[PDB]
C-alpha cells in the first residue's frame, strides 16, 4: 500500500514494495506417550 | 545430533484398597498354658 509499504519517494524512486506473511506447519517428529489407569471401580 | 521418536511409554496405577481396622482384634494375654514365645501376640484361627 501507499504507506503500508512505500511512500512517495519510493515512488518518485520508483520502487514497487509488497510485505508477504505466512504461517508454518510443523512435522510431527516424536512420539510422548503418557498412559491413565482410570481405576472404573 | 540426532533423535529417534521416543515413544515414551508410561502409565498408571489404582487401589485405595486399604481397610483393615484391627481394633476390634481382641488379644489374648496369659500366661502359656503348660514352645511359643513369652512375648509376642499370637493370631488364632480357631480353639480347634
Not at chain 1, 9 to 21: F, W
Amino acid at each position: 500500500g501507499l504507506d503500508e509499504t512505500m511512500t512517495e519517494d519510493d515512488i518518485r524512486h520508483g520502487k514497487m514494495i509488497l510485505q508477504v506473511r505466512l504461517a508454518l506447519l510443523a512435522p510431527a517428529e516424536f512420539i510422548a506417550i503418557s498412559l491413565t489407569l482410570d481405576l472404573r471401580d | 545430533t540426532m533423535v529417534l521418536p521416543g515413544v515414551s511409554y508410561n502409565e498408571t496405577l489404582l487401589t485405595q484398597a486399604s481397610n483393615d481396622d484391627p481394633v476390634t482384634m481382641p488379644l489374648f494375654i496369659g500366661y502359656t498354658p503348660p514352645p511359643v514365645t513369652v512375648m509376642q501376640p499370637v493370631s488364632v484361627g480357631s480353639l480347634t
